[PDB]
Design a protein around this ligand. Structure first.
Ligand SMILES: CCn1c(=O)[nH]c(=O)c2c1nc(Cc1cn3cc(C)sc3n1)n2Cc1ccc(-c2ccn(C)n2)cc1
Ligand SMILES: [Fe+3]
Length: 291
């Protein structure tokens, strides 16, 4: 039989809370694992997300001087690389975010402001999320153009690397592309395909999501560029992906969905999409075969 799936955007209240691992449940190897102050801060953020209901303004947070410094460090170094590494759609939308949502070295943008910006541009919106969700619940958000977003900042001891999502990743990696209509349609269709799909189908859609939205490359004017959010917020892997040292393959869902998604290392392979339009067409053809 068909599993429950959300039928309207407020139904995400029922699955967005089905958290399998709360944001305060730090990995044993987390730089903040023994940091009681950081742990309390992470509990604060996770509780904000747990208490959020669709329709609410996303709670505004007063970030600490330390948090803002971490953001600034990441922001400065990544912005030096984006002109030569990022796809054209990313570079087009980044300056709009500095103008309208307060993207600056000494200011962390509020999720509510970014959500309002996205709603006007592509109808995307943000929901703060309280931890790790099943791929079914996470992807279902995309069907309503809702991106489940972390609100906390990575631990200050290691500004440039983390295997965990944080708000620097959401804001610098994901949001500039969610502002692009072609990419928003691509992402929404991953969500729509997942609704009520088999467990097997959801897993394959999640792998395709991983190797596009999180770690995708695209080819533009003959050049390899980056659009994956996980690359766009990781200075070391961003450089690596466009070095000659990375294995790259064409994006092709029936092949891509066989690839293991790696967590604590660089990816073993990256997939190159010809365009967001073409990636979208390839996923349409693929979803017919698995539903
Ligand atoms: C379709 C796969 N997929 C899923 O099945 N479910 C998701 O919940 C999910 C996801 N994908 C992403 C987004 C994501 C994960 N991730 C890791 C990076 C490094 S950059 C980045 N973006 N998320 C959101 C998410 C939210 C929180 C955690 C997490 C890990 C450790 N803690 C304490 N919390 C992990 C992932
Ligand atoms: Fe992400």
């Amino acid at each position: 039989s068909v599993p429950w799936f959300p039928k309207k955007i407020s139904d995400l209240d029922h699955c967005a809370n089905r958290v399998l691992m709360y944001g305060s449940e730090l990995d044993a190897d987390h730089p903040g694992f023994k940091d009681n102050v950081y742990r309390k801060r992470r509990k604060y953020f996770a509780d904000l997300a747990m208490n959020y209901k669709h329709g609410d303004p996303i709670p505004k947070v007063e970030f600490t001087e330390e948090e803002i410094k971490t953001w600034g460090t990441v922001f400065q170094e990544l912005n030096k690389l984006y002109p030569t590494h990022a796809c054209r759609e990313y570079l087009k939308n980044l300056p709009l975010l500095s103008k309208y949502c307060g993207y600056r070295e000494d200011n962390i943008p509020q999720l509510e402001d970014v959500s309002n910006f996205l709603k006007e541009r592509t109808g995307f919106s943000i929901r703060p999320v309280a931890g790790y969700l099943s791929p079914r619940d996470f992807l279902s958000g995309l069907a309503f153009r809702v991106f489940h977003c972390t609100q906390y900042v990575r631990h200050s001891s290691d500004p440039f690397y983390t295997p965990e999502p944080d708000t620097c990743h959401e804001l610098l990696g994901h949001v500039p592309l969610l502002a692009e209509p072609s990419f928003a349609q691509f992402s929404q269709e991953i969500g729509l395909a997942s609704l009520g799909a088999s467990e097997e189908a959801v897993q394959k859609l999640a792998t395709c999501y991983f190797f596009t939205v999180e770690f995708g490359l695209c080819k533009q004017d003959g050049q390899l560029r980056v659009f994956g959010a996980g690359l766009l917020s990781s200075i070391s892997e961003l450089k690596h992906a466009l070095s000659g040292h990375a294995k790259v393959k064409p994006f092709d869902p029936k092949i891509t969905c066989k690839q293991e998604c790696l967590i604590t290392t660089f990816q073993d392979v990256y997939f190159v999409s010809e365009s967001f339009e073409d990636a979208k067409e390839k996923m349409r053809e693929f979803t017919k075969t698995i539903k």
